[PDB]
Design a binder for this molecule. Structure first.
Ligand SMILES: CCN(c1ccc(OC)cc1)S(=O)(=O)[C@@H]1C[C@@H]2O[C@H]1C(c1ccc(O)cc1)=C2c1ccc(O)cc1
Ligand SMILES: CCN(c1ccc(OC)cc1)S(=O)(=O)[C@H]1C[C@H]2O[C@@H]1C(c1ccc(O)cc1)=C2c1ccc(O)cc1
Lengths: 9, 227, 236, 10
């Protein structure tokens, strides 16, 4: 998920 | 473990510091707009706000202590509520209007059901003279609370969230005592503020429902979570 | 013009709310465990229909409610009725973990929840609420205050009198927690905890209401006219 | 003319 990605940046 | 070692003043300081910027829309006063282009403007705006919300969420004390999967879930559950309370806050000083953006101020003539409820909430905040320090507390509460009862013996994650939640409550009371409110007035105002959250949840749910009655890739996935 | 409700003491408010409490109703005595959408909704529609009649007469005994215009009374009940049924369900389900006590002779586990679609999701939310209440050791005096808050709050933004009555109940809630020996910090922390649960009860109601419409626009069980009118007040 | 209007009256 996009939300998933942007969170772990 | 930092979240649980902060004083009330440090908590407020951190939350005010984490506050996202107010973004502009692509509204052009001279251009004519259909219902499709107006929703396009708002979708574009909301989609850009989400990126800032995510970074804001990570600066909310205790949020990064959570697993990634729990972070995703909380944001999936609360994203519309958080957008709404943000809209309602910056619309306080514009009675009968919602300030989606500094260049985008609308009245009910221009969804109208949700609009009305958002106006009522804004009017409600204005009458209470909601402070910015109280607003950031409320918004953080929404982020942490909205998905906490819809998550495997993990339950410690739930416990940590509730401890942080209790802290924001302490912080709220601290703020009201600072403003010179009597002990009775603090408890009353605390109740008043938190009851408004039930309405904001209501507005979010009804908003989704009317929508299922074009979107960005991120929004579509956020939407997926409430279905 | 002056409301009687605001003149009551904290204990008088508690006593009034306790005395106004509706009874716990039974469902049909057929020992058949409902394992179909029809049989399930069949028993539930019947139960909630009878509960509604008690709720309407309960609401009239909530201090301050009588002072409202007839139209405002209708509006509040239309907005809050499912929330009130739910918190009642959750309250009496407390001492039955993993189970929902719709009636003393109608105890359901989540294994039966599946048997309509989207029910099991609401089922788990209700179970979580009940479990949450149990761990908090929610008292009956606290419960009746919360239920009255739901009545007066859920339709208030859709006025000053209601907010004064709501403040009165807040005072009452704190009074109960102080009587229970809670420290000042424990008092406002618990009040916040309880009121945040009301947000989730609103959520469950929004979701549940959505399914009552699907069931209606499925022509499944004969829905009563009262229910159909309570239901259509939430239509878009 | 709602049933609720009638039931709330007495
Ligand atoms: C029924 C239309 N709605 C809606 C739209 C999209 C959506 O999710 C994709 C959910 C609801 S709605 O709730 O009225 C919604 C509230 C309000 O107007 C709609 C809306 C919005 C939000 C996202 C969109 O893609 C479109 C519209 C609002 C909004 C936008 C930004 C912001 O900072 C605050 C609010
Ligand atoms: C998990 C249960 N749910 C559900 C959906 C199924 S749910 O939404 O809570 C709710 C709607 C449905 O079932 C729950 C419930 C109910 C009934 C009585 C009561 O005292 C408490 C709740 C329901 C119900 C209510 C009225 C009806 O005409 C039919 C059903």
């Amino acid at each position: 998920k996009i939300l998933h990605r942007l969170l772990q940046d | 473990s930092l979240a649980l070692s902060l004083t009330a003043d440090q908590m407020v300081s951190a939350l005010l510091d984490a506050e996202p910027p107010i973004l502009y829309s692509e509204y052009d006063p001279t251009r004519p707009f259909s219902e499709a282009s107006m929703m396009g403007l708002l979708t574009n705006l909301a989609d850009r706000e989400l990126v800032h919300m995510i970074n804001w969420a990570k600066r909310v004390p205790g949020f990064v202590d959570l697993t990634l999967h729990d972070q995703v879930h909380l944001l999936e559950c609360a994203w519309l509520e958080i957008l709404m309370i943000g809209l309602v806050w910056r619309s306080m000083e514009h009675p009968g209007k919602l300030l989606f953006a500094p260049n985008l101020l609308l009245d009910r003539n221009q969804m109208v059901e949700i609009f009305d409820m958002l106006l009522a909430t804004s009017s409600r905040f204005r009458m209470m003279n909601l402070q910015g320090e109280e607003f950031v507390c409320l918004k953080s509460i929404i982020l942490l609370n909205s998905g906490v009862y819809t998550f495997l013996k993990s339950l410690e994650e739930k416990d940590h969230i509730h401890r942080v939640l209790d802290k924001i409550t302490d912080t709220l009371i601290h703020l009201m005592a600072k403003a010179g409110l009597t002990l009775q007035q603090q408890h009353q105002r605390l109740a008043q503020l938190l009851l408004i959250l039930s309405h904001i949840r209501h507005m979010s749910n009804k908003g989704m429902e009317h929508l299922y009655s074009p979107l960005s890739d991120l929004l579509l996935e956020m939407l997926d979570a409430h279905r």
